[PDB]
Amino acid sequence: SQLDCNFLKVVSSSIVDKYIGESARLIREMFNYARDHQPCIIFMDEID
Amino acid sequence: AHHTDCTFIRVSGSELVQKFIGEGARMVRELFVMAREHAPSIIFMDEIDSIGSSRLEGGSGGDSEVQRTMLELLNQLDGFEATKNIKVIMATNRIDILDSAL
Amino acid sequence: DVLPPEADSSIMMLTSDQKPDVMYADIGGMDIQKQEVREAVELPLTHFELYKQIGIDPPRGVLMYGPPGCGKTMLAKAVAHHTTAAFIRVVGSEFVQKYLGEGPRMVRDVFRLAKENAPAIIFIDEIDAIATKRFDAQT
Numbered sequence: 001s002q003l004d005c006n007f008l009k010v011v012s013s014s015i016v017d018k019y020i021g022e023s024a025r026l027i028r029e030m031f032n033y034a035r036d037h038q039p040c041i042i043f044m045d046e047i048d
Numbered sequence: 049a050h051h052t053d054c055t056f057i058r059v060s061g062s063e064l065v066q067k068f069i070g071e072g073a074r075m076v077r078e079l080f081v082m083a084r085e086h087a088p089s090i091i092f093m094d095e096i097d098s099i100g101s102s103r104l105e106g107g108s109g110g111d112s113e114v115q116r117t118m119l120e121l122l123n124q125l126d127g128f129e130a131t132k133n134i135k136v137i138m139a140t141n142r143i144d145i146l147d148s149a150l
Numbered sequence: 151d152v153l154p155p156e157a158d159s160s161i162m163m164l165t166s167d168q169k170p171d172v173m174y175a176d177i178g179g180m181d182i183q184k185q186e187v188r189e190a191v192e193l194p195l196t197h198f199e200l201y202k203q204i205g206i207d208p209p210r211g212v213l214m215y216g217p218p219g220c221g222k223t224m225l226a227k228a229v230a231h232h233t234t235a236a237f238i239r240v241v242g243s244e245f246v247q248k249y250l251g252e253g254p255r256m257v258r259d260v261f262r263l264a265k266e267n268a269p270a271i272i273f274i275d276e277i278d279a280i281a282t283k284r285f286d287a288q289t
């Protein structure tokens with residue numbers, strides 16, 4: 001309802017990996033994704 | 049290593065352990081084959097509690113693949129074939145934890 | 151032809167573009183520790199001749215030791231920022247992995263990358279899991 005309108009970012013599970021490299025890659029990918037648009041807010045639920 | 053012109057061949061402790069089954073024994077067999085191919089040689093297995101210790105009762109209650117690698121090394125050190133001009137140096141703390149075979 | 155060295159896929163090395171943002175002035179007055187960690191890591195690296203002229207073979211490893219939060223990781227970030235050599239930080243938790251042998255492989259690869267990338271400083275932070283005694287495992 002605020003001037004964000006961009007909420008969704010369905011949960012966050014894909015960032016699980018076996019080395020910090022893949023997690024850094026995925027997180028900067030999502031950070032650039034958020035930078036794509038107006039203030040983007042990332043749902044972080046679905047964790048166990 | 050620095051005074052003998054034999055052909056030193058290193059092996060760390062956690063280096064013959066490979067996740068894929070059997071790859072932890074093909075490596076030892078290839079090691080000794082290379083040694084035989086290289087005439088006088090000496091192998092200094094560094095801390096060797098890794099491929100060592102004592103055989104544990106099997107099942108899903110202990111390590112087994114490391115046990116198979118230990119067995120392969122044992123057989124190649126003294127088995128049906130008598131290795132010639134190959135000598136092994138093993139160093140490892142805690143002499144009392146090794147197996148009764150090695 | 152021979153191409154430039156490659157295959158730095160699992161590049162945990164900072165090497166610019168991820169450096170921490172702290173100088174040696176966002177840390178409040180840890181004077182003794184600051185001097186000691188400097189004389190352990192920073193001093194041997196730049197003023198190398200300052201050491202051999204005494205026959206020392208500078209120290210190669212330093213530990214951190216303190217209550218739950220006191221700035222251990224912060225001084226690590228600072229030393230990493232104000233440094234000329236590489237810097238790879240791997241926590242002592244990414245080593246206890248599932249598939250067997252895949253653990254020690256990570257240590258071997260970390261040190262191989264360190265040696266293959268010139269002078270380097272390897273930071274193993276919160277290493278309290280894999281350091282604890284012997285307790286000859288029968289399990």
Ligand SMILES: Nc1ncnc2c1ncn2[C@@H]1O[C@H](COP(=O)(O)OP(=O)(O)O)[C@@H](O)[C@H]1O
Pocket residue numbers: 176177178179217218219220221222223224225276
């Ligand atoms: N003296 C200090 N100066 C600046 N920041 C500090 C100081 N002490 C604690 N902090 C802040 O508190 C946090 C505690 O970090 P630290 O205690 O090193 O982590 P750890 O629990 O791994 O030791 C740091 O991120 C830092 O931002």
